[PDB]
Tab-separated table of C-alpha atoms and ligand atoms in Angstrom:
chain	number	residue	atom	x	y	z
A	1	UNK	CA	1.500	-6.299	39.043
A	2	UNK	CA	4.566	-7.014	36.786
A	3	UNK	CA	3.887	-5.063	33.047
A	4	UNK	CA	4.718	-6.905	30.488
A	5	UNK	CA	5.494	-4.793	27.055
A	6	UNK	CA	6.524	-6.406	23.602
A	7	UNK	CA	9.190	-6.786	22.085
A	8	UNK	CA	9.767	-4.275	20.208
A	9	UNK	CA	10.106	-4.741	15.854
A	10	UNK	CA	14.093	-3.846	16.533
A	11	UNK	CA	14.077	-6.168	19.359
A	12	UNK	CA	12.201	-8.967	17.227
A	13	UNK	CA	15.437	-8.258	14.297
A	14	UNK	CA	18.171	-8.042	17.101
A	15	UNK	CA	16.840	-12.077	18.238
A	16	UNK	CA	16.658	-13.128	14.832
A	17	UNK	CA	20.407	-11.570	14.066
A	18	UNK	CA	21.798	-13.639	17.013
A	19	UNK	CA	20.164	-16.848	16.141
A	20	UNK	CA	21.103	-16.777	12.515
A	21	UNK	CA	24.552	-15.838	13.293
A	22	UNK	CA	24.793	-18.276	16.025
A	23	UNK	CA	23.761	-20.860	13.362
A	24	UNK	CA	26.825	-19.919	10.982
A	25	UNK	CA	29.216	-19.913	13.673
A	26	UNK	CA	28.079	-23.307	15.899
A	27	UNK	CA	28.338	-26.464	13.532
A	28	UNK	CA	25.804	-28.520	16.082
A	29	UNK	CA	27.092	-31.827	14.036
A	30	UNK	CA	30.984	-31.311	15.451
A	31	UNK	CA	32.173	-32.282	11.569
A	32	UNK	CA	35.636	-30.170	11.604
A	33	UNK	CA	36.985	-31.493	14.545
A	34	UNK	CA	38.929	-35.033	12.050
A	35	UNK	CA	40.603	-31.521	11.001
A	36	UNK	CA	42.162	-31.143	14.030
A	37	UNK	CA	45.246	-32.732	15.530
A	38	UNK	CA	44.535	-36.093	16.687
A	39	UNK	CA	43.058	-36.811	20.301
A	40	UNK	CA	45.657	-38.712	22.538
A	41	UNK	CA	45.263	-40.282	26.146
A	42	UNK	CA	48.049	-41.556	27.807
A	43	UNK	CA	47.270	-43.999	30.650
A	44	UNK	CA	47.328	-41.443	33.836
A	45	UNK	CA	44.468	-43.099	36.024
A	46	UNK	CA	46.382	-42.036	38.998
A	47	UNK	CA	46.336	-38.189	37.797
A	48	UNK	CA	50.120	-37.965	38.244
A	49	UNK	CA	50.851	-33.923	37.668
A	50	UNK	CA	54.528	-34.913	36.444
A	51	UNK	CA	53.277	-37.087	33.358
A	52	UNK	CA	50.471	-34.846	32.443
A	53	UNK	CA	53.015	-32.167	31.675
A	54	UNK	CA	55.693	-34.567	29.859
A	55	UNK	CA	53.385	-35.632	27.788
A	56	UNK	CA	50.692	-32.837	27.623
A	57	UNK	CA	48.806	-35.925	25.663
A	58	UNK	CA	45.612	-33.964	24.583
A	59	UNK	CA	46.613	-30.299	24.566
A	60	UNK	CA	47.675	-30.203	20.673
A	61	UNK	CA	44.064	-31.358	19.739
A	62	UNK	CA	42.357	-29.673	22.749
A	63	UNK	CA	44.269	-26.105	21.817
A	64	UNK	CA	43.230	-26.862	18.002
A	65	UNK	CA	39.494	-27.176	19.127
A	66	UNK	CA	39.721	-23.859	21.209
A	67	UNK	CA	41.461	-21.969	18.763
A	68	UNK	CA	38.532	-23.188	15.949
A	69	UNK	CA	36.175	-21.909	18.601
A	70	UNK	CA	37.727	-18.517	18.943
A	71	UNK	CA	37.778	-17.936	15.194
A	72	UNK	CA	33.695	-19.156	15.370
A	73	UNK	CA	33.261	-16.693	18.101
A	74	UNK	CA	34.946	-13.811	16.277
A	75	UNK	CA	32.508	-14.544	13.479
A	76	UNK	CA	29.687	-14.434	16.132
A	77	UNK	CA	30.463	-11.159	17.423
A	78	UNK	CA	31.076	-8.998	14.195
A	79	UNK	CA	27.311	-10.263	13.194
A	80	UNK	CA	25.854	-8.520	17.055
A	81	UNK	CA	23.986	-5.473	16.107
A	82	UNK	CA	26.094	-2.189	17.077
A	83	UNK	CA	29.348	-4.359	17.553
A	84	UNK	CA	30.960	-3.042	14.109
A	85	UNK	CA	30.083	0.758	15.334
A	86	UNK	CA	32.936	0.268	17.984
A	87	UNK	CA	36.989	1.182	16.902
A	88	UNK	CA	38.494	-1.885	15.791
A	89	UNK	CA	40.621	-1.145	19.006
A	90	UNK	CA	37.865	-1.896	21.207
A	91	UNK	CA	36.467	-4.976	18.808
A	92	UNK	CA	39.690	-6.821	20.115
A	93	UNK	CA	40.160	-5.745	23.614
A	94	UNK	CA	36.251	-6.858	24.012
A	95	UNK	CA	37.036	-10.047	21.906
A	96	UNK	CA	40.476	-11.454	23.818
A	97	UNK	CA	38.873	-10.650	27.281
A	98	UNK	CA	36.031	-12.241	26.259
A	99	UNK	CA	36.813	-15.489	24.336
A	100	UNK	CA	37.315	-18.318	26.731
A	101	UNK	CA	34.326	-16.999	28.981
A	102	UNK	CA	32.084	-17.564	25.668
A	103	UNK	CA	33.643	-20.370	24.808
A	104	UNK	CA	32.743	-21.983	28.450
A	105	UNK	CA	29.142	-20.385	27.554
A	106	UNK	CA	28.978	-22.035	23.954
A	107	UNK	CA	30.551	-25.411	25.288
A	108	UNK	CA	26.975	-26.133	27.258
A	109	UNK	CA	25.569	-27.117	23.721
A	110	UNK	CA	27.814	-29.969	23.830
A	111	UNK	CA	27.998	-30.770	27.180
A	112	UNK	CA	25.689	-33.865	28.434
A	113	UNK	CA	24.466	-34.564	31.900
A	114	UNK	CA	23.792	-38.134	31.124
A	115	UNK	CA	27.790	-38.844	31.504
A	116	UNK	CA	28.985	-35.356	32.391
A	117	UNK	CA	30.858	-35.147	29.479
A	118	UNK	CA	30.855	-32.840	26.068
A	119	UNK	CA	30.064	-34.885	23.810
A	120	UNK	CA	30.972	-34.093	20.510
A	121	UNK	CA	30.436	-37.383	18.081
A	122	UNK	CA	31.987	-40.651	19.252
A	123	UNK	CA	34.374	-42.037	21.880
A	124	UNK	CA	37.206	-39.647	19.816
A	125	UNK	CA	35.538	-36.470	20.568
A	126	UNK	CA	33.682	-37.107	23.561
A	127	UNK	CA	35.597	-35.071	26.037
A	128	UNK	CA	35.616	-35.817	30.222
A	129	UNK	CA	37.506	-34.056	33.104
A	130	UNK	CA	40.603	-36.778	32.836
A	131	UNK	CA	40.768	-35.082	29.424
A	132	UNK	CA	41.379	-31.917	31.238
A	133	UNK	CA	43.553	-33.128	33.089
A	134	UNK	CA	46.166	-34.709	30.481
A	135	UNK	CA	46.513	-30.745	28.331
A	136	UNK	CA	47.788	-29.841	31.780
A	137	UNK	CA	45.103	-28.199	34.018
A	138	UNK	CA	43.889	-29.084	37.541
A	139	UNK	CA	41.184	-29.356	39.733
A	140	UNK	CA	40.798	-25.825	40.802
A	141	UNK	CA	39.418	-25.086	36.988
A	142	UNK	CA	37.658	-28.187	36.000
A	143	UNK	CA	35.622	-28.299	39.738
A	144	UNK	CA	33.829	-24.922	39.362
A	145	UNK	CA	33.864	-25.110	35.870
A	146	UNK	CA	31.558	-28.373	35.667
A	147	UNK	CA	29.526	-26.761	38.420
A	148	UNK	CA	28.861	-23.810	35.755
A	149	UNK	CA	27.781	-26.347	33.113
A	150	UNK	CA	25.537	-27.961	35.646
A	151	UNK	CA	24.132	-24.859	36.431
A	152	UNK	CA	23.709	-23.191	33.158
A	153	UNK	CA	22.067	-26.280	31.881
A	154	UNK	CA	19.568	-26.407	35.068
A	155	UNK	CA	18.276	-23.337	33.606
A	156	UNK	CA	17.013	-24.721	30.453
A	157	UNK	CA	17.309	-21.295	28.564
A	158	UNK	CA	15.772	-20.663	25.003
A	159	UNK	CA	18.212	-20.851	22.401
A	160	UNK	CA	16.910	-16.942	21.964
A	161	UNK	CA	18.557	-16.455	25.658
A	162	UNK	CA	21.504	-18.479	25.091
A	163	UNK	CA	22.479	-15.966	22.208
A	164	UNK	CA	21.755	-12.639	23.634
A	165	UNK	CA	23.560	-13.936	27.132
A	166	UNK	CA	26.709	-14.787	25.021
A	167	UNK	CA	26.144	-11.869	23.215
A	168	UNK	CA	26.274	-9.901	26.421
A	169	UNK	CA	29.187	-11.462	27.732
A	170	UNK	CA	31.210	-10.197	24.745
A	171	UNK	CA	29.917	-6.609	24.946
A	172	UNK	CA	30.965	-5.843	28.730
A	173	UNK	CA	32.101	-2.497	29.283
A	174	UNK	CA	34.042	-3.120	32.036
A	175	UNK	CA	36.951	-4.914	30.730
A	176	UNK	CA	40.114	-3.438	31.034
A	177	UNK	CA	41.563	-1.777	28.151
A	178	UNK	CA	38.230	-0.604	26.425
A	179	UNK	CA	38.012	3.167	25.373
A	180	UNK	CA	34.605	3.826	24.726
A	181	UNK	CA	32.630	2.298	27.811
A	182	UNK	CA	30.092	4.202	26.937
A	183	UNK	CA	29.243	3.500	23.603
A	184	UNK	CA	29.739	-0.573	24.593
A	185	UNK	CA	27.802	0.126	27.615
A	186	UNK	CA	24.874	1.248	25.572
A	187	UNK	CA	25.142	-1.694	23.108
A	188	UNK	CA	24.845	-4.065	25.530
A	189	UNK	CA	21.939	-1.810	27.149
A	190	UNK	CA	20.451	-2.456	24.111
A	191	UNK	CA	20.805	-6.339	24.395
A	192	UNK	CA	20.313	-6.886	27.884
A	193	UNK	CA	16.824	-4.843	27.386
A	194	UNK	CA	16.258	-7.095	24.585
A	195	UNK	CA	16.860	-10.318	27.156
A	196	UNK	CA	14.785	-8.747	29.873
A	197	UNK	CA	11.515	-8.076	27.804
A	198	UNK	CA	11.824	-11.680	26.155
A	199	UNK	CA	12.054	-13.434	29.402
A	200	UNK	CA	9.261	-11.596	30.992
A	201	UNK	CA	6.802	-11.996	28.133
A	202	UNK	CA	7.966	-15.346	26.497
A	203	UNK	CA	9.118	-17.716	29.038
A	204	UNK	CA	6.879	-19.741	30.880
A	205	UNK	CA	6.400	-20.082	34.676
A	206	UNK	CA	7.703	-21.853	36.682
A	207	UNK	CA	11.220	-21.392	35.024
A	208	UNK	CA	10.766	-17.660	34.513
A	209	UNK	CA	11.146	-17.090	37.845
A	210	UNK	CA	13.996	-15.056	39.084
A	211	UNK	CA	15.907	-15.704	35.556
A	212	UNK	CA	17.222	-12.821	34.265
A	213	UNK	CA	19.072	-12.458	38.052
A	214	UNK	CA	20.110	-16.384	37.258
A	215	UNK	CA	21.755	-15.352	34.164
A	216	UNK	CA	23.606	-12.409	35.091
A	217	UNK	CA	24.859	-14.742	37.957
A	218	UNK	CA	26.633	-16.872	35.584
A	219	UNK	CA	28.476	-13.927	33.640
A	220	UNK	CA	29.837	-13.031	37.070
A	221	UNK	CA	30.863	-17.265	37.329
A	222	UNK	CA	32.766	-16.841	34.117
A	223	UNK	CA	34.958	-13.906	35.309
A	224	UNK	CA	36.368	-16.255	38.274
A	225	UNK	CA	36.737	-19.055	35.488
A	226	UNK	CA	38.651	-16.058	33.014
A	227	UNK	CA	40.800	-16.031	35.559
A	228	UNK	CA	41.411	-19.325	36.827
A	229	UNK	CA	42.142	-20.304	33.254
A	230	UNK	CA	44.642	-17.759	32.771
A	231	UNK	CA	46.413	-18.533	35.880
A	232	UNK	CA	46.792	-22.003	34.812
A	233	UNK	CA	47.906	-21.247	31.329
A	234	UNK	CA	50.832	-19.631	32.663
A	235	UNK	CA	52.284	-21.592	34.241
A	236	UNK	CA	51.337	-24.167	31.663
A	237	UNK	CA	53.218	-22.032	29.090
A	238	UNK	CA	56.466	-22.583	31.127
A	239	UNK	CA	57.060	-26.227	30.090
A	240	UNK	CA	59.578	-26.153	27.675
A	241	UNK	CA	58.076	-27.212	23.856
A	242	UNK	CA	54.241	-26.354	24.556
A	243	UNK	CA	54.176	-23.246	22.119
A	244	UNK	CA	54.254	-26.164	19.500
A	245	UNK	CA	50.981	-27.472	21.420
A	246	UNK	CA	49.149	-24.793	20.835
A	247	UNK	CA	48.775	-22.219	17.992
A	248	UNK	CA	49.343	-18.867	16.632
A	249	UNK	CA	46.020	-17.459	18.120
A	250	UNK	CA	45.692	-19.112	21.176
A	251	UNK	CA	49.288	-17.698	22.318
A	252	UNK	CA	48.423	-14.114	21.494
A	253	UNK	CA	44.490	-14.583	23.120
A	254	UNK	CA	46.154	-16.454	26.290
A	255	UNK	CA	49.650	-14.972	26.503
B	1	2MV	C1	35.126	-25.542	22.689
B	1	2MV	C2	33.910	-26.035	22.498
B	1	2MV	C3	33.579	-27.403	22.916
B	1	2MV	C4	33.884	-27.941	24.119
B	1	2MV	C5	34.557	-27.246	25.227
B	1	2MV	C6	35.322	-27.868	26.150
B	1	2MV	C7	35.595	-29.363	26.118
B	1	2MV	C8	37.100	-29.642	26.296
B	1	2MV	C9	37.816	-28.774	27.353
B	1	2MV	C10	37.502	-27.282	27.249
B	1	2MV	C11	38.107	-26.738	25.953
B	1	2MV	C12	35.988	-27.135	27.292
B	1	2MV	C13	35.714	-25.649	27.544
B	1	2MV	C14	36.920	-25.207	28.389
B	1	2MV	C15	37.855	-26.431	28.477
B	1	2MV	C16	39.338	-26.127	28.825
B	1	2MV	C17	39.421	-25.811	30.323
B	1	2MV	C18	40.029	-24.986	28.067
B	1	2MV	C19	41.489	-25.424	27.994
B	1	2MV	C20	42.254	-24.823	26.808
B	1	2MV	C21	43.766	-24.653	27.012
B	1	2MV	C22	44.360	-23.927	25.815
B	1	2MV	C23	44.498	-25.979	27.195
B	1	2MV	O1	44.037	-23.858	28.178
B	1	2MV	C24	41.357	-26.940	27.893
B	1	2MV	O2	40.156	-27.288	28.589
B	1	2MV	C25	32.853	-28.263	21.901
B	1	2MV	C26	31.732	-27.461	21.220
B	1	2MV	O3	30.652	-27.267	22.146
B	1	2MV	C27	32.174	-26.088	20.690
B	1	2MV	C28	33.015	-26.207	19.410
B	1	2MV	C29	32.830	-25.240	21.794
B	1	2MV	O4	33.312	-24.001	21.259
């Protein structure tokens, strides 16, 4: 019984938009990162809390990677139709709530389930959950957070999906702080419409099935992680020297 209409011409623009400025913004070659701060692992095989934060042995490159990522993402979202319409006010209450959630969605290009790692060149880059670990987080982030990338990969989306769902994720009405839910509500109307009609007329059983649902599961999975992550920065923040560990952006996004 299901109809399946078209995509419209402005829907056909809107996927080509996202693509193209997902393209700018995701380097899929990981060449900036001998920019950062070097990559340093202490020897912690035990997973000793008390020398994970006296040495916090992989947050200065780890922060440097997340803060590159948020600047990428800001890039992203000023090129998603209807997101420059918005008050710059709203641009960066939608932005800061949103950047570590897209970052976790962006992160699944890297990530690998042949060694459940994200692997981002060699044995330098490639980054596990003992990596976690050692810039001071703990189990009750990295667990559900590697069941998310499991997850999310399971689906196999189209690279079109991937876009518009990150997309969506950034233009959420519901945040707290936003003036104009309306106008973002209809912007991402726009976009989740776009998602919809693509799924239902361009991906193939059996995969299809139930997706749209899927993915709108997973943006409700990032809102536990947003938070988990921000509980654990906090306290994080409180050992004495990390400020240095991290940088300019990342303290105003997380603090
Ligand atoms: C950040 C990206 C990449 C990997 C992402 C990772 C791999 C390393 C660990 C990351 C950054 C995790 C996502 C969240 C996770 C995190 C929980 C975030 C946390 C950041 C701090 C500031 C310490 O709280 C440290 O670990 C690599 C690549 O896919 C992109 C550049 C992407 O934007």
């Amino acid at each position: 019984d299901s109809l399946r209409p078209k995509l419209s011409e402005e829907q056909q623009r809107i996927i080509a938009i996202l693509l193209d400025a997902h393209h700018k913004t995701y380097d899929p070659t990981y060449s900036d990162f001998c920019q950062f701060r070097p990559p340093v692992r202490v020897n912690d095989g035990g997973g000793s809390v008390t020398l994970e934060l006296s040495q916090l042995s992989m947050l200065p490159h780890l922060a440097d990677l997340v803060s590159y990522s948020i600047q990428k993402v800001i890039g992203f979202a000023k090129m998603i139709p209807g997101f420059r319409d918005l008050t710059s006010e709203d641009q960066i209450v939608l932005l800061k709530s949103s950047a570590i959630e897209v970052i976790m969605l962006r992160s699944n290009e890297s990530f690998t389930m042949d060694d459940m790692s994200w692997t981002c060149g060699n044995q330098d880059y490639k980054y596990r959950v003992s990596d976690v670990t050692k810039a001071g987080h703990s189990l009750e982030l990295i667990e559900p957070l590697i069941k998310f990338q499991v997850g999310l990969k399971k689906l196999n989306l189209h690279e079109e999906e991937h876009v518009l769902l990150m997309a969506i994720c950034i233009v959420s009405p519901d945040r707290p702080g936003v003036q104009d839910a309306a106008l973002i509500e209809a912007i991402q109307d726009r976009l989740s419409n776009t998602l919809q009609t693509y799924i239902r007329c361009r991906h193939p059983p059996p995969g299809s099935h139930l997706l749209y649902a899927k993915m709108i599961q997973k943006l409700a999975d990032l809102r536990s992680l947003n938070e988990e992550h921000s509980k654990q920065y906090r306290c994080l923040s409180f050992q004495p020297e990390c400020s240095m560990k991290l940088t300019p952006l990342v303290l105003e996004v997380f603090g």
